[model samples]
Target chain A: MNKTELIKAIAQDTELTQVSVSKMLASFEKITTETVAKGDKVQLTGFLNIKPVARQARKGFNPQTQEALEIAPSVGVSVKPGESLKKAAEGLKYEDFAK
Target chain B: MNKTELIKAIAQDTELTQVSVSKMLASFEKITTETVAKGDKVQLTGFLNIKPVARQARKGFNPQTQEALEIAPSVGVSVKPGESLKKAAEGLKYEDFAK
Candidate 1:
């Protein structure tokens, strides 16, 4: 679902107005972005954890010129889906499904 | 962070009460779980997308007997973080960072 659909779902499920849900979702994204930018993690139970990872700079060859170039290190976010979320996605029950 | 901390952050960021934030978060989890359980994808712009992947059954080695055993097929959830989220996590600017 898209953002609009998601906001609607949140509104219906939470008994909140669509405008309020939209605001909450926007804030959620903002906080997540800010937190991860600071190299911290955000966890929502039964959903997932958002965290950052660092990649070190390294030397690489330029394919066209075959010249050596230094690649700067960078950070990226990763998500670890919760067990319940995983189960739901796969459409399997934890009790009967052997993993 | 833990659930309580997350709720607090959401409340503070959204200008919502802690109770309301907590409830909204709970509903968010529920909707995500339900949507994924139906093999659908949930996308939150600037955050991540939640989806299910199916793994087919395959033969596996039995460690104890070193015999072949049939492994049942299963489903699992995966998260694809958005570009902004990835940048935040990695602590790098898209313009300067070459990936």
Candidate 2:
């Protein structure tokens, strides 16, 4: 389901116009970006979660130059499915994959 | 930010009532779950993506029984952040982690 499809689907489910759903989705993206960028977790319990994960600086070699260098510590986003999504995945039938 | 906070934030940004934002969020979760459960990808460009991943059956041993067994193939959900989230993480400063 692409973004357009998702917007249409949500609009149908909520009886909201697609324009409104689109506006809400854009707001969601903006707020989520700002929140996680600040090292906070976006916890949508039982559905989804997003957080900032930090990796420690480490020693590394340049693949081409063969010189050792320090890899700086950095932050990245961690996205995880919550309980409801996990249960939905677990309930998938093997037959669902026969294709 | 938790779900309630997120909803309030989004309502404020979109100028939608909190109740409307909340309804849209629920619909988003339901549609996303149903789509991913059916082995479809929910692609929210530059923000989020979700897809069903299949793990192949593999050989494994029972630690307690010391017996070999076949691990069944299973489906799991993979939730990933897209370009915008990646950029947000990449922009994090080392100083941000001092705490």
RMSD vs true structure, all candidates? 6.1, 6.0
In angstroms, the error of model 2 at A67 is: 15
B-chain TM-score of model 1 = 0.61
For every candidate, what is the interface RMSD in angstroms? 4.7, 4.1
Candidate 1 local lDDT, residue B32:
72
Candidate 2 C-alpha lDDT tens digits along A66-89: 443554445666687654664455
> What are the lDDT scores of the predictions, listed in order?
0.62, 0.60
| Model 2 lDDT per residue over B15-98, tens place | 378667677567757766676656446676555576555444654667875665423544455677645665565445434553
Pick the TM-score winner: 1
Q: For chain B alone, what TM-score does every candidate structure achieve against the true structure?
A: 0.61, 0.60
Which ranges of candidate 1 are over 4 A from the true structure?
A40-42, A53-75, A90-99, B54-75, B92-99
**Every model's DockQ, to 2 decimals?**
0.33, 0.33
